[PDB]
Amino acid sequence: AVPESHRKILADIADEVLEKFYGCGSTLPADGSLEGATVLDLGCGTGRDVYLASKLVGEHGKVIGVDMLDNQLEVARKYVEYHAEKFFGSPSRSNVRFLKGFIENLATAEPEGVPDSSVDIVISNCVCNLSTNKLALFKEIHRVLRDGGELYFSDVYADRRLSEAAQQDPILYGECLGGALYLEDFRRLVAEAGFRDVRLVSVGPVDVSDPQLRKLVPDVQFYSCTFRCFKVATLEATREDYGQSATYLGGIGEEFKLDRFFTFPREKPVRVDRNTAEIIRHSRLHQWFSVSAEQQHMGLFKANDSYALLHAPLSMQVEQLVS
Ligand SMILES: [Ca+2]
């Protein structure tokens, strides 16, 4: 937890914001990739993650938080000036705002709604499983994102379908296990929402130890997954070879790790499927990459040392890439 680069910025953030923040922090993409981005944190709380992003996006970027806990927002809302001077030398130069509303309908949040195609990166940590309608949440994320933008988030998933009994249990529900999707049900739902290519960034195990809770979910394996789901018009459901290479140019780290299949060393050409090329080309990432032209179609993409897993269901990717 807590990368070194963030550590200094957190030391700067108002102690009331940190003391009262509920939850784990939203993980963020590589810091350099955030410059100038518009970022939205679903379930922002006291604003810990909003304020951290504020600094990293710089003065041209902007950050929006949403949440419906009155108490937590009121804290967030009154340290705007604080952080605008601590990051940007004047108290009237804040690049952030907090909105009150259900994450399921961003359009009706207060002061203002989040308009269509206005956001580069949507972040959240552990909001979906406590959510009332997952599909409507995902559809709404897709609405607010611009082309090339991404949902970059962490949640709890399961390696199989939970029983109605487990879904009804209030302790399980509250731990965000009860509402966990089977990963394949997840992949289909999110695709029905418009996101056709889901990329695994990292995965951790989650254990249920308490013997009676465990009895509702006997052999179920839960995982904490961070996924990134780009909104890019040209993506297909399959990962197809059109003979391309991408080359990370430098500037935002020694190397760029797109997901658990694709790592790009500075100035070394790496062969890529066309989905991966389109993500690079239409996302903010284009700035730090060179992507070669589409040739003739060559079949499914195999020029990767884990290609069989690359095409396998999410379930197999996750379980293999923990162990
Ligand atoms: Ca949060």
PDB file of N, CA and C in Angstrom, residues 30 33 228 230 245-259 262-272 276-292:
ATOM      1  N   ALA A  30      -0.237   4.992 -13.498  1.00  0.00           N
ATOM      2  CA  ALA A  30       1.077   5.653 -13.377  1.00  0.00           C
ATOM      3  C   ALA A  30       0.951   7.181 -13.318  1.00  0.00           C
ATOM      4  N   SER A  33       1.065   9.573 -16.204  1.00  0.00           N
ATOM      5  CA  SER A  33      -0.055   9.444 -17.149  1.00  0.00           C
ATOM      6  C   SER A  33      -1.247  10.286 -16.757  1.00  0.00           C
ATOM      7  N   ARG A 228      -8.809  -2.457 -15.738  1.00  0.00           N
ATOM      8  CA  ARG A 228      -8.950  -1.237 -16.488  1.00  0.00           C
ATOM      9  C   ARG A 228      -9.731  -1.554 -17.739  1.00  0.00           C
ATOM     10  N   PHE A 230     -11.074   0.283 -21.019  1.00  0.00           N
ATOM     11  CA  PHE A 230     -11.071   1.460 -21.878  1.00  0.00           C
ATOM     12  C   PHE A 230     -12.348   1.627 -22.682  1.00  0.00           C
ATOM     13  N   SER A 245       3.281  -3.193 -33.954  1.00  0.00           N
ATOM     14  CA  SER A 245       4.127  -2.944 -32.805  1.00  0.00           C
ATOM     15  C   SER A 245       3.851  -1.577 -32.184  1.00  0.00           C
ATOM     16  N   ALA A 246       3.965  -1.520 -30.864  1.00  0.00           N
ATOM     17  CA  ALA A 246       3.954  -0.275 -30.127  1.00  0.00           C
ATOM     18  C   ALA A 246       5.313  -0.109 -29.448  1.00  0.00           C
ATOM     19  N   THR A 247       5.739   1.137 -29.346  1.00  0.00           N
ATOM     20  CA  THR A 247       7.000   1.460 -28.684  1.00  0.00           C
ATOM     21  C   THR A 247       6.768   2.599 -27.707  1.00  0.00           C
ATOM     22  N   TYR A 248       7.009   2.310 -26.431  1.00  0.00           N
ATOM     23  CA  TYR A 248       6.937   3.291 -25.358  1.00  0.00           C
ATOM     24  C   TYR A 248       8.134   4.237 -25.499  1.00  0.00           C
ATOM     25  N   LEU A 249       7.856   5.520 -25.579  1.00  0.00           N
ATOM     26  CA  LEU A 249       8.892   6.496 -25.927  1.00  0.00           C
ATOM     27  C   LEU A 249       9.705   6.977 -24.748  1.00  0.00           C
ATOM     28  N   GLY A 250       9.224   6.734 -23.529  1.00  0.00           N
ATOM     29  CA  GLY A 250       9.791   7.304 -22.302  1.00  0.00           C
ATOM     30  C   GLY A 250       8.982   8.465 -21.802  1.00  0.00           C
ATOM     31  N   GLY A 251       9.247   8.876 -20.569  1.00  0.00           N
ATOM     32  CA  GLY A 251       8.726  10.146 -20.057  1.00  0.00           C
ATOM     33  C   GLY A 251       7.902   9.969 -18.795  1.00  0.00           C
ATOM     34  N   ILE A 252       7.336   8.784 -18.629  1.00  0.00           N
ATOM     35  CA  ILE A 252       6.476   8.549 -17.494  1.00  0.00           C
ATOM     36  C   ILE A 252       6.906   7.315 -16.726  1.00  0.00           C
ATOM     37  N   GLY A 253       8.210   7.052 -16.771  1.00  0.00           N
ATOM     38  CA  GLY A 253       8.807   5.987 -15.991  1.00  0.00           C
ATOM     39  C   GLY A 253       9.812   5.277 -16.856  1.00  0.00           C
ATOM     40  N   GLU A 254      10.592   4.423 -16.241  1.00  0.00           N
ATOM     41  CA  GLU A 254      11.553   3.655 -16.968  1.00  0.00           C
ATOM     42  C   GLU A 254      10.843   2.723 -17.953  1.00  0.00           C
ATOM     43  N   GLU A 255       9.689   2.171 -17.564  1.00  0.00           N
ATOM     44  CA  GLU A 255       8.898   1.357 -18.476  1.00  0.00           C
ATOM     45  C   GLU A 255       7.418   1.517 -18.238  1.00  0.00           C
ATOM     46  N   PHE A 256       6.611   1.099 -19.213  1.00  0.00           N
ATOM     47  CA  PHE A 256       5.166   1.209 -19.049  1.00  0.00           C
ATOM     48  C   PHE A 256       4.489  -0.158 -19.059  1.00  0.00           C
ATOM     49  N   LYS A 257       3.801  -0.425 -17.960  1.00  0.00           N
ATOM     50  CA  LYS A 257       3.079  -1.671 -17.732  1.00  0.00           C
ATOM     51  C   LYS A 257       1.609  -1.347 -18.012  1.00  0.00           C
ATOM     52  N   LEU A 258       1.099  -1.825 -19.138  1.00  0.00           N
ATOM     53  CA  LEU A 258      -0.280  -1.643 -19.477  1.00  0.00           C
ATOM     54  C   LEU A 258      -1.207  -2.587 -18.678  1.00  0.00           C
ATOM     55  N   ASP A 259      -0.868  -3.862 -18.671  1.00  0.00           N
ATOM     56  CA  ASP A 259      -1.611  -4.845 -17.912  1.00  0.00           C
ATOM     57  C   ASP A 259      -0.686  -6.060 -17.686  1.00  0.00           C
ATOM     58  N   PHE A 262       1.109  -7.092 -21.093  1.00  0.00           N
ATOM     59  CA  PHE A 262       1.835  -6.101 -21.839  1.00  0.00           C
ATOM     60  C   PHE A 262       2.652  -5.128 -21.033  1.00  0.00           C
ATOM     61  N   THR A 263       3.963  -5.334 -21.108  1.00  0.00           N
ATOM     62  CA  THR A 263       4.978  -4.424 -20.557  1.00  0.00           C
ATOM     63  C   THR A 263       5.839  -3.908 -21.731  1.00  0.00           C
ATOM     64  N   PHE A 264       6.056  -2.615 -21.720  1.00  0.00           N
ATOM     65  CA  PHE A 264       6.739  -1.916 -22.812  1.00  0.00           C
ATOM     66  C   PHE A 264       8.034  -1.222 -22.287  1.00  0.00           C
ATOM     67  N   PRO A 265       9.202  -1.809 -22.532  1.00  0.00           N
ATOM     68  CA  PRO A 265      10.441  -1.150 -22.069  1.00  0.00           C
ATOM     69  C   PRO A 265      10.674   0.073 -22.913  1.00  0.00           C
ATOM     70  N   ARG A 266      11.315   1.092 -22.342  1.00  0.00           N
ATOM     71  CA  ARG A 266      11.563   2.355 -23.022  1.00  0.00           C
ATOM     72  C   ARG A 266      12.276   2.054 -24.340  1.00  0.00           C
ATOM     73  N   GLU A 267      11.793   2.615 -25.440  1.00  0.00           N
ATOM     74  CA  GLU A 267      12.353   2.381 -26.783  1.00  0.00           C
ATOM     75  C   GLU A 267      12.560   0.956 -27.290  1.00  0.00           C
ATOM     76  N   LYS A 268      11.866  -0.048 -26.752  1.00  0.00           N
ATOM     77  CA  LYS A 268      11.911  -1.385 -27.363  1.00  0.00           C
ATOM     78  C   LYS A 268      10.548  -1.703 -27.997  1.00  0.00           C
ATOM     79  N   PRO A 269      10.548  -2.102 -29.280  1.00  0.00           N
ATOM     80  CA  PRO A 269       9.282  -2.378 -29.983  1.00  0.00           C
ATOM     81  C   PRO A 269       8.670  -3.661 -29.456  1.00  0.00           C
ATOM     82  N   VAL A 270       7.370  -3.627 -29.124  1.00  0.00           N
ATOM     83  CA  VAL A 270       6.663  -4.813 -28.617  1.00  0.00           C
ATOM     84  C   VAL A 270       5.482  -5.068 -29.518  1.00  0.00           C
ATOM     85  N   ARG A 271       5.382  -6.297 -29.974  1.00  0.00           N
ATOM     86  CA  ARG A 271       4.264  -6.718 -30.797  1.00  0.00           C
ATOM     87  C   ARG A 271       2.954  -6.673 -30.016  1.00  0.00           C
ATOM     88  N   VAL A 272       1.887  -6.201 -30.675  1.00  0.00           N
ATOM     89  CA  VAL A 272       0.550  -6.020 -29.995  1.00  0.00           C
ATOM     90  C   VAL A 272      -0.607  -6.402 -30.899  1.00  0.00           C
ATOM     91  N   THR A 276      -5.128  -3.553 -28.344  1.00  0.00           N
ATOM     92  CA  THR A 276      -4.103  -2.896 -27.534  1.00  0.00           C
ATOM     93  C   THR A 276      -3.575  -1.682 -28.258  1.00  0.00           C
ATOM     94  N   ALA A 277      -3.389  -1.792 -29.565  1.00  0.00           N
ATOM     95  CA  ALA A 277      -2.953  -0.640 -30.388  1.00  0.00           C
ATOM     96  C   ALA A 277      -3.964   0.503 -30.409  1.00  0.00           C
ATOM     97  N   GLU A 278      -5.231   0.167 -30.589  1.00  0.00           N
ATOM     98  CA  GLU A 278      -6.316   1.168 -30.572  1.00  0.00           C
ATOM     99  C   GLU A 278      -6.407   1.885 -29.212  1.00  0.00           C
ATOM    100  N   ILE A 279      -6.216   1.152 -28.120  1.00  0.00           N
ATOM    101  CA  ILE A 279      -6.210   1.738 -26.751  1.00  0.00           C
ATOM    102  C   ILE A 279      -5.099   2.761 -26.579  1.00  0.00           C
ATOM    103  N   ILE A 280      -3.924   2.355 -27.004  1.00  0.00           N
ATOM    104  CA  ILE A 280      -2.795   3.239 -27.058  1.00  0.00           C
ATOM    105  C   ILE A 280      -3.011   4.411 -27.943  1.00  0.00           C
ATOM    106  N   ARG A 281      -3.447   4.186 -29.174  1.00  0.00           N
ATOM    107  CA  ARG A 281      -3.710   5.301 -30.105  1.00  0.00           C
ATOM    108  C   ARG A 281      -4.828   6.238 -29.661  1.00  0.00           C
ATOM    109  N   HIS A 282      -5.970   5.729 -29.190  1.00  0.00           N
ATOM    110  CA  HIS A 282      -7.086   6.654 -28.841  1.00  0.00           C
ATOM    111  C   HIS A 282      -7.062   7.143 -27.398  1.00  0.00           C
ATOM    112  N   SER A 283      -6.270   6.501 -26.529  1.00  0.00           N
ATOM    113  CA  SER A 283      -6.197   6.989 -25.152  1.00  0.00           C
ATOM    114  C   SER A 283      -5.214   8.133 -25.028  1.00  0.00           C
ATOM    115  N   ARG A 284      -5.176   8.717 -23.834  1.00  0.00           N
ATOM    116  CA  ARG A 284      -4.153   9.683 -23.460  1.00  0.00           C
ATOM    117  C   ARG A 284      -2.750   9.095 -23.604  1.00  0.00           C
ATOM    118  N   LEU A 285      -2.642   7.781 -23.668  1.00  0.00           N
ATOM    119  CA  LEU A 285      -1.302   7.182 -23.688  1.00  0.00           C
ATOM    120  C   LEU A 285      -0.520   7.417 -24.976  1.00  0.00           C
ATOM    121  N   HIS A 286      -1.224   7.842 -26.046  1.00  0.00           N
ATOM    122  CA  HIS A 286      -0.624   8.101 -27.368  1.00  0.00           C
ATOM    123  C   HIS A 286       0.604   9.018 -27.268  1.00  0.00           C
ATOM    124  N   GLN A 287       0.566   9.914 -26.288  1.00  0.00           N
ATOM    125  CA  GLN A 287       1.579  10.926 -26.085  1.00  0.00           C
ATOM    126  C   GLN A 287       2.914  10.307 -25.814  1.00  0.00           C
ATOM    127  N   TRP A 288       2.950   9.134 -25.189  1.00  0.00           N
ATOM    128  CA  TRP A 288       4.215   8.483 -24.822  1.00  0.00           C
ATOM    129  C   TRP A 288       4.533   7.236 -25.592  1.00  0.00           C
ATOM    130  N   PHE A 289       3.896   7.053 -26.739  1.00  0.00           N
ATOM    131  CA  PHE A 289       4.066   5.821 -27.507  1.00  0.00           C
ATOM    132  C   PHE A 289       4.080   6.113 -28.975  1.00  0.00           C
ATOM    133  N   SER A 290       4.746   5.240 -29.702  1.00  0.00           N
ATOM    134  CA  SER A 290       4.647   5.119 -31.159  1.00  0.00           C
ATOM    135  C   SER A 290       3.982   3.778 -31.504  1.00  0.00           C
ATOM    136  N   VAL A 291       2.898   3.826 -32.273  1.00  0.00           N
ATOM    137  CA  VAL A 291       2.194   2.631 -32.691  1.00  0.00           C
ATOM    138  C   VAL A 291       2.217   2.484 -34.185  1.00  0.00           C
ATOM    139  N   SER A 292       2.646   1.330 -34.663  1.00  0.00           N
ATOM    140  CA  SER A 292       2.831   1.117 -36.090  1.00  0.00           C
ATOM    141  C   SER A 292       1.526   0.867 -36.789  1.00  0.00           C
TER     142      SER A 292
END
